Design a protein around this ligand. Sequence first.
Ligand SMILES: CC(=O)N[C@@H]1[C@@H](O)[C@H](O)[C@@H](CO[C@@H]2O[C@@H](C)[C@@H](O)[C@@H](O)[C@@H]2O)O[C@H]1O
Ligand SMILES: CC(=O)N[C@@H]1[C@@H](O)[C@H](O)[C@@H](CO[C@@H]2O[C@@H](C)[C@@H](O)[C@@H](O)[C@@H]2O)O[C@H]1O
Ligand SMILES: CC(=O)N[C@@H]1[C@@H](O)[C@H](O)[C@@H](CO[C@@H]2O[C@@H](C)[C@@H](O)[C@@H](O)[C@@H]2O)O[C@H]1O
Ligand SMILES: CC(=O)N[C@@H]1[C@@H](O)[C@H](O)[C@@H](CO[C@@H]2O[C@@H](C)[C@@H](O)[C@@H](O)[C@@H]2O)O[C@H]1O
Lengths: 325, 322, 322, 325
Amino acid sequence: NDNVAWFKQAKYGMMIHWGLYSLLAGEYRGESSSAYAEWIQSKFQIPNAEYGNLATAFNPLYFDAKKIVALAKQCGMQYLVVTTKHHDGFAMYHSKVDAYNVYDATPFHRDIIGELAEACQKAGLKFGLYYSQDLDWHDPNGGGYKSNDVETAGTTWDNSWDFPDEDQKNFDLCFDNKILPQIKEIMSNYGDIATAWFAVPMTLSEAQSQTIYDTVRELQPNCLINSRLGNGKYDFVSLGDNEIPKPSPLGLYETAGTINDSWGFSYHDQNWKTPRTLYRYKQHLNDFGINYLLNVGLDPLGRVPMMAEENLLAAKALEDEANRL
Amino acid sequence: NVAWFKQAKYGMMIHWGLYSLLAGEYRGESSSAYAEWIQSKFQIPNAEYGNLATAFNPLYFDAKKIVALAKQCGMQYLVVTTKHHDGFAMYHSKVDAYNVYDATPFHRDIIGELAEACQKAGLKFGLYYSQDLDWHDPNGGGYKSNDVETAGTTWDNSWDFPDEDQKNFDLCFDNKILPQIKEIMSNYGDIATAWFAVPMTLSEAQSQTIYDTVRELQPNCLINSRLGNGKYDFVSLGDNEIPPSPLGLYETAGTINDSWGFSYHDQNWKTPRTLYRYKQHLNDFGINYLLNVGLDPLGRVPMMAEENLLAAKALEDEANRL
Amino acid sequence: NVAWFKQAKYGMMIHWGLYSLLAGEYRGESSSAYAEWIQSKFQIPNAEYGNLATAFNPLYFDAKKIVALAKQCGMQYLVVTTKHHDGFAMYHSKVDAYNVYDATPFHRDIIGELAEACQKAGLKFGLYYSQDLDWHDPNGGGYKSNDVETAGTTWDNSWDFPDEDQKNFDLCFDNKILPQIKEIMSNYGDIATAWFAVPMTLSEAQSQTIYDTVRELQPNCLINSRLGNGKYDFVSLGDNEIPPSPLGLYETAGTINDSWGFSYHDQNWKTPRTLYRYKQHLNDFGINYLLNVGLDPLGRVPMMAEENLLAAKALEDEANRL
Amino acid sequence: NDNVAWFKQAKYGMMIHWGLYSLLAGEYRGESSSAYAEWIQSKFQIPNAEYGNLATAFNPLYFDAKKIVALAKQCGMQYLVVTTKHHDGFAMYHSKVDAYNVYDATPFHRDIIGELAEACQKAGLKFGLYYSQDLDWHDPNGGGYKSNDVETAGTTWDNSWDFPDEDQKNFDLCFDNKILPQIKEIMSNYGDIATAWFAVPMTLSEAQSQTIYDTVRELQPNCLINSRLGNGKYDFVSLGDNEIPKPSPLGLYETAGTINDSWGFSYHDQNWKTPRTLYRYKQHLNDFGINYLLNVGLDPLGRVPMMAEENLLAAKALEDEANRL
Ligand SMILES: CC(=O)N[C@@H]1[C@@H](O)[C@H](O)[C@@H](CO[C@@H]2O[C@@H](C)[C@@H](O)[C@@H](O)[C@@H]2O)O[C@H]1O
Ligand SMILES: CC(=O)N[C@@H]1[C@@H](O)[C@H](O)[C@@H](CO[C@@H]2O[C@@H](C)[C@@H](O)[C@@H](O)[C@@H]2O)O[C@H]1O
Ligand SMILES: CC(=O)N[C@@H]1[C@@H](O)[C@H](O)[C@@H](CO[C@@H]2O[C@@H](C)[C@@H](O)[C@@H](O)[C@@H]2O)O[C@H]1O
Ligand SMILES: CC(=O)N[C@@H]1[C@@H](O)[C@H](O)[C@@H](CO[C@@H]2O[C@@H](C)[C@@H](O)[C@@H](O)[C@@H]2O)O[C@H]1O
């Protein structure tokens, strides 16, 4: 596991958020999502029957793994993270365990995680996966239902509309049958997984948390794990905005951000960070040994938004200018 | 129909086609201000552009809700792109399989649903048709008028069909335009208004011909000053043409933002106050206002389009009680 | 005054000071979301920032027109920055020459003109005052609470006066705050509402003291829950505090865009529909809505602020006849 | 006059629009100017009495000639053009002949053209002047009054509100007493004038046009003149949008543009051309030997707008990256 040497010096990665939310793109029956377009289902409490129907329209003719990695590489990014399955519970890979996925439910009929994994392999880009182990709005017993006190980017953390029998919910039925099986799948196919990115535990017991830790280590021996899974059970610390100038034993650090203000594609969110904002931030994080993980929200046709692409390239140009200074 | 049109005051225009899905973006680059021209701007081969049809699945398209919205804003008629410059028919065309019904997963007659929804809602129903430009046909129009600049590149499909001189527009007219014009003027019930583009190549003969087809099939259908000089019922006026028309019928078209087709990046929405003031001014001059919405790939009125249109109606009402 | 405040529903807040002229820009760089903090964000020396006073000449400032506008929107009271964190008084302060009247070409009492304009217009008149932060005074407040982050840098003027421990807030309170509070509570006629900032350093003693000054001078003046616990009349609620107050009087403050001070670059204006819906929701919960405008260097309501506020009023009226 | 060799290779210049219009910044009594904020007086037919009053507020503490030229030079611009006097008739220099000027009428009490001229001299930047020889809204007999047929960025071309006796107007009274005297002043002080930039003649007779030509040649022997003055009477052709791929005998070409859509500062016009748009356009023009003259509309405090500055620098960075390719 030389992953430690490479990660301390990697400096820069691309993150991709993509799913059904990208097609609504922050808009519903004349109204805006919150800041988080990928949260749109919770914001408006969209029934699974309706929300799920987007799968029939998901036909991104312009999705192109080859082209995306070329762009990333040109900007000097050394690794790539992708949404394998977000809060909405729609798998972006061909899951044996669950047919609610890009491959089975959509005209596209293709493995999003796969095509990117290969392209990355060939380009010499490391390949990471993101997975939402706790919230899952598709599963009757999804997590979140005891932590509804805290405010969210939607309404409740859990699917409180389709499944309102709050007391009769049991996350375990969800954990054993979907989360752990799906985690097993993604950690086994698509080759070497360099980085593992989990969502924020609210409900997953330490037992359940420990299980995932163990599962990943045996399946992907060299895979570095983000501090989010569970206390004691990680390799690099994910830093949040206010953690920017808990303990990291390998000396490995990452902060994730987006270029505009949303993680998922949002038509109306044109508040793109300037090239200079992008470059300066990277410089500051890197000098503090913190890696910068920069998100692209793919558009409905599978394209990097024009303004996202432009701004990334200018920050790279600025960087080169400045580093020959 | 004449009395009704003189008092109508307000109409909806709809741009819709394959171009709406690219939404102003092509291989990392921006369309012009006019997003619906996107195929020409970048000279997208017919094979590829047409392929968009395989992705055209607007689950949230809803003629009823759209017309309900239109009516709520006080609009008395609605015009729709039956077929724009791209040569893609948005109705179930017998003569050409390059159409919404046969070529797309959606597999539905957009014009039909709107025609019925309008009939049932008691809204008049108009049609737009590109009788001159046709980027899908080897002998499509446009190739004699290329000195003047466009919102794309050439007027014609000069890329797939570059044999400029061996092109002959007559072959296209005989086989696609007039048949398609015949199609739309017979189905979809009463057609109150007919909207044609600006001839470049269509001879006076051809211009007169289309007129006749409409008169025989749709006697009271009012025709826009674009067909031919002497051979029309209302004059289309542009912004800069307003400070003959034999019936005294007048219309000016605009868009809410700066594009006709949906364009992700064009958020330069005119404020509600701008929209309302213009209509009042036009109406006071008896000019009818036809205001265009370019619906997005899911068939939705863009949020800012809907909000601002509705706010303009509220603004109008306050002032007429004032 | 209590009965009137319970039914008022709608107020204007005004941010104004030297910061408005920089308008979100300093030596090529952006302020935070909160433009009025600009001096702290970049640690602009008092000598330089104060120098803005020499440029403060708002020829188009017009209290009458502003109040006319406010009244037209149905607002029943108006609050103004008498002196914000920057420590610049926007009224003719006897105690400190760092003020609009003496230090600026404009040479006018902004609060006075507004107080009169409001009296004459029949609008109630409120005051905002930064009783705690004061970036102009060597011993200004803020220096005991620097672990928590701000919209600038430090809470206090930690740059001109970096001798953190040899600072003593009491000296500032005695010489500037309470005298200035005394000033504003005696002149400018009837004061209906009083708006203080969040204590960091102001002891309970000092908090109680200001209260007394207001009660003696302005018996019916209603006081915002910021002064001190038990020692107040209405509770200021923030967005996230709403899904004690002994009189049942409540107010929530917001801005139209994302900044309090004028900021050239902050064009993220909330649409009219957003503004109207929020007010209705608050009012239904009896919470009064106080909506802030940061006037620009010429004393003007920004075009998009005026347009959207007025459109929101029209929107409100339509719905209550519906 | 080696100006020919230098200009064919100069490639890039800064233009500055600045005057009273910058303080209204595209806004009047709750309403927007047209696209051209510097036209604001005509758009709303603002009486001279009111419009002129802005002079008392013109106190740009942050005007800084030194800093502006440094920025320009860093972007590789080889010359600088400035508004000496725009359509509004407000002189931005200390005019002996007319007290309606930055020096006499404003607290600033400073010569805008002068301070920039010196800074440019010291930096090794060439120094050009723009002057509106035809429209002058301050003069009772200003030009424009026979050409009111054509649509403008305001209303009429002339001051049609304060001075409506259209038939009793005589441009000559204006030409002899203000235009030619003021042109004499600006072409004599402030040292060598490398470039001369005139507005669009509508009304200035050939006689009057010839006069200006002659006046400049004797006063500034080596000064290159923009094709706008008069047919036969120029050194470089000013190209407009539609003249971009009449006759230029020296082979000298310039196109002027702005970064956003306005020439004068406009608070509300945030439609800044992207860095990439700026760079690509320059490249295209330069390859066709056409010089690119790029406008900055100084803000009320005399500062280059933040987004204007940022975008210029990124285009330069992109250019450097690409030219080492
Ligand atoms: C109140 C609120 O919205 N708080 C948000 C959380 O809702 C949000 O989950 C969290 C981080 O966002 C999570 O991680 C990113 C990477 C993306 O996957 C989101 O969809 C996740 O929800 O940020 C808080 O501020
Ligand atoms: C530069 C440019 O292309 N300018 C365009 C013209 O090309 C265009 O013909 C004209 C009219 O627009 C026509 O009608 C609208 C409704 C839409 O269908 C366009 O695609 C048509 O070309 O508008 C000018 O601005
Ligand atoms: C990160 C940050 O600074 N957040 C700010 C706080 O600093 C601020 O205290 C709080 C309340 O804002 C206060 O009142 C408004 C009206 C204005 O005068 C501000 O300058 C004050 O500080 O708001 C948080 O968002
Ligand atoms: C109809 C219209 O607005 N036409 C405008 C003219 O009004 C305008 O004068 C012209 C060029 O603008 C002139 O030159 C620039 C450099 C600047 O000084 C402007 O203030 C001048 O008016 O462009 C036409 O399109």
